[PDB]
Amino acid sequence: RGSHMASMETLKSNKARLEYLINDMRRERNDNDVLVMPSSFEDLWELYRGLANVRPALPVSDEYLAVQDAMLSDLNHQHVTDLKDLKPIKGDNIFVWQGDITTLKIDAIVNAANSRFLGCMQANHDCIDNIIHTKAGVQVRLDCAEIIRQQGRNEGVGKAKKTRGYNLPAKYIIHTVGPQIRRLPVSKMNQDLLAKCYLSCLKLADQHSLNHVAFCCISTGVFAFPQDEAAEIAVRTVESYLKETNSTLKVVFNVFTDKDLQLYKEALNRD
Ligand SMILES: [Zn+2]
C-alpha cells in the first residue's frame, strides 16, 4: 500500500507525533499510570482523538501546537478535494458533494455546533462537530471559548460565528447552532430557526466576501430534525437567498450517506 505511494516515512513520523501528543495530554490530566501505547496508526489516532475531545479549553503550548499542526496538516491534505475540480448540479453556483468535509478546499465549511460552542466533548463520537474540531485542531475550541467568554453567554440558535479552519484545507469554519427537535411534527418556530441557521451562515460568508461555503446537514443526527424536511429547508433557503441577493457565492451541500445524497438531488430538481 504505502511503499508504492512512498508513504512509509510519513506514517512512522505521524505515529511518533501522536505518541507525543497523547503523552502530553495524559500528563496534563495527571494520568501518570503507564499505558500500553498501541503500535498501529489507527489505535493511536482513536486514543489521541478521545483525549482531544474531552480536554477543557485550557491554554496550550506553542510546542504542542507545532507537533499537532504538523500531524493534522499532513493527515488532512493527503486526499484533498478541490471545489475547482467539481461541477455545479444547479445553475453555476450550487453543488452536491459526497465526501469528508474536513478534506474539502473551500473558503468556508459550516459546523453544526452546540450552544456551549466548544465542540463535541464525547470521546470518539461520530458527529460533525467532533470531526471538524478534531481535524482542525485544538485552536478552534480555544477560539470558540474566547467568543463565548467575550459575549458572556452561551450561543443562541440560528446564528453564525466564524473562526479560522487551521489544519483543515478550508480557510474558515462558520459555526451555527441548529434547533433541537423533541416532538413531532416540527413546529413552525423550529422550521423558521433552521432556515435562520442557513441564512445567518450565507449572510456572514457574503459579509466577509468569501467565494464559497459548504454546508453539512444541520440539525440531523442527535438534534434529530427529520431528514427530508431538513433537506427541503436547506435547499429552499439557499436558493431563495441566492436569487434575492444575486450573491456570487458558490454553495456546496456536503453529504455522506446515499440517502442524503438522493434527498438533495431530488430537492434541487423540484420547482
Ligand atoms: Zn458529538
Author numbering: -6 to 264
Sentences from the paper on this structure:
His118 (SauMacro) coordinates the Zn2+ ion via the sterically more demanding, but tighter coordinating, Nδ1 nitrogen. The Zn-loop appears to be partially stabilized by contacts with the 3α-bundle. Among these residues, Arg42, Asn46, and Asn123 (SauMacro) are among the most conserved and make backbone contact to the loop and among each other, thus establishing a tight packing. The diphosphate-binding loop supports ligand binding and can transition between an open and closed confirmation. However, our data do not support this binding mode: first, the different orientation of the diphosphate-binding loop in our apo structures shortens the cavity, which would sterically hinder the binding of the dithiolane moiety. Among these mutants, zinc coordination is strictly associated with catalytic activity, thus demonstrating a direct role of the Zn2+ ion in catalysis. Deletion of the N-terminal 3α-bundle (ΔN, aa 1–70) leads also to the loss of zinc-coordination, which is consistent with our structural observation that the Zn-loop is partially stabilized by the 3α-bundle.
